[PDB]
Enzyme design. Structure first.
Site, PDB file in Angstrom:
ATOM      1  N   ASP A 176     -57.323 -86.276  47.935  1.00 62.37           N
ATOM      2  CA  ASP A 176     -55.883 -86.123  47.698  1.00 62.37           C
ATOM      3  C   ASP A 176     -55.059 -87.057  48.573  1.00 62.37           C
ATOM      4  O   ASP A 176     -54.839 -86.775  49.750  1.00 62.37           O
ATOM      5  CB  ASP A 176     -55.491 -84.655  47.949  1.00 62.37           C
ATOM      6  CG  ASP A 176     -53.996 -84.380  47.770  1.00 62.37           C
ATOM      7  OD1 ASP A 176     -53.222 -85.288  47.413  1.00 62.37           O
ATOM      8  OD2 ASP A 176     -53.599 -83.209  47.970  1.00 62.37           O
ATOM      9  N   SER A 213     -41.921 -99.240  42.793  1.00 65.06           N
ATOM     10  CA  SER A 213     -42.262 -99.932  41.562  1.00 65.06           C
ATOM     11  C   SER A 213     -41.104-100.807  41.115  1.00 65.06           C
ATOM     12  O   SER A 213     -39.943-100.437  41.288  1.00 65.06           O
ATOM     13  CB  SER A 213     -42.613 -98.921  40.479  1.00 65.06           C
ATOM     14  OG  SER A 213     -42.718 -99.564  39.230  1.00 65.06           O
TER      15      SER A 213
END
Ligand SMILES: O=C(CNCCc1c[nH]c2ccccc12)Nc1sc2c(c1C(=O)NCc1ccccc1)CCCC2
Length: 330
Positions: free
Chosen positions: A35, A199
């Site tokens: 994770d 992004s």
């Protein structure tokens, strides 16, 4: 040193991925959810409330000759979905695919919430975000990757998640046969303890690319892709019949649909998530309405590039002095 292990979806929908980890002496193999969105290594154990355990393999520290109680340490964690767990702590030997750490904090659970009890395929979590997030008190513990860092041929790990298929986590090296083209590296902020990056934008299907800053975290511990409401509305607008359901808590769509792809930008580069990857099956058994794999991050506070996005990419988590993140098509 290096390590390489196979990671496998827990079900036909890739709701999560488990990777075999060896703990203690002799080895107890538990299947853990790697994770990158948290920082605790915690496990179902012989100390877990028997009614909260249902099929999971347990770690029994009394049976490990190298396990040592960390005096006075406790841990308690809550993920922003409802689920949570807590317990006490041991240090033990922990290996992933040949790669070995002695004295890794192994957080034994005394209580787990419903979400985990219900998932019999998951024996715990192995957190790969930054050690600042680790919840052990009164003395913070280090993640597996942090403990291993100095020994790795390179201070890196890569995540190569498969769509409805097995994948690979590697430690210490980058497998050049695992991706197409080049790896595009982008800057990471650790200020919130995550592999947080920005992004450069998105496209829906073969629609024109839109340049816009989308700050979010690279998170293998999260199933779906959570993006801003505007972006996510732009996506589901291209699926006939798709709507946001309050009763369900997100966008659902007609199971008969053919989903368009989603593209996200890493710098000048583009990762393309096939429409396939965005389908998460009937909302309930037998239903013709399917849950979407791209959801609004509106009530979350941060965008999350979960498995849906990461499994379309070969992803490098670069723990060098200034951490960066790398993405490559595959
Ligand atoms: O905490 C993580 C990654 N670890 C998740 C561990 C986990 C929770 N429930 C599970 C069930 C099965 C296997 C693993 C898990 N990511 C992170 S980081 C982060 C959030 C979350 C999160 O909860 N993601 C999953 C999720 C988000 C939104 C809605 C529903 C779910 C929300 C607050 C901002 C920072």
């Amino acid at each position: 040193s290096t390590g390489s292990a196979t990671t496998t979806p827990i079900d036909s929908l890739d709701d999560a991925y488990i990777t075999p980890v060896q703990i203690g002496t002799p080895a107890q193999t538990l299947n853990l959810d790697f994770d990158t969105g948290s920082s605790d290594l915690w496990v179902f154990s012989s100390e877990t409330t028997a009614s909260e355990v249902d099929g999971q393999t347990i770690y029994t520290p009394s049976k490990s000759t190298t396990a040592k109680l960390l005096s006075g340490a406790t841990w308690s964690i809550s993920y922003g979905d409802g689920s949570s767990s807590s317990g006490d702590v041991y240090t033990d030997t922990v290996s992933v695919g040949g790669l070995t750490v002695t004295g890794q904090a192994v957080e034994s659970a005394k209580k787990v919430s419903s979400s985990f009890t219900e998932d019999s395929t998951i024996d715990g979590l192995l957190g790969l975000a930054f050690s600042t997030l680790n919840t052990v008190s009164p003395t913070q513990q280090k993640t597996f990757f942090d403990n291993a860092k100095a020994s790795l041929d390179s201070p890196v790990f890569t995540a190569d998640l498969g769509y409805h298929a097995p994948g690979t986590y590697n430690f210490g090296f980058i497998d050049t046969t695992a991706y197409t083209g080049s790896i595009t590296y982008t800057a990471v902020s650790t200020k919130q303890g995550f592999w947080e990056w920005t992004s450069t934008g998105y496209a829906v299907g073969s629609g024109t690319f839109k340049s816009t800053s989308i700050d979010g975290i690279a998170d293998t511990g999260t199933t779906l892709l959570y993006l801003p409401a505007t972006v996510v509305s732009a996506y589901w607008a291209q699926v006939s019949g798709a709507k946001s359901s309050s009763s369900v808590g997100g966008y659902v769509f007609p199971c008969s649909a053919t989903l368009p792809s989603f593209t996200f930008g890493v710098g000048s580069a583009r990762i393309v998530i096939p429409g396939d990857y965005i389908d998460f099956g009937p909302i309930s058994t037998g239903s013709s309405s399917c849950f979407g794999g791209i959801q609004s991050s509106a009530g979350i506070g941060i965008n999350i590039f979960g498995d849906v996005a990461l499994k379309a990419a070969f992803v490098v988590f670069n723990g060098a002095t200034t951490p960066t993140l790398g993405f490559a098509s595959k």
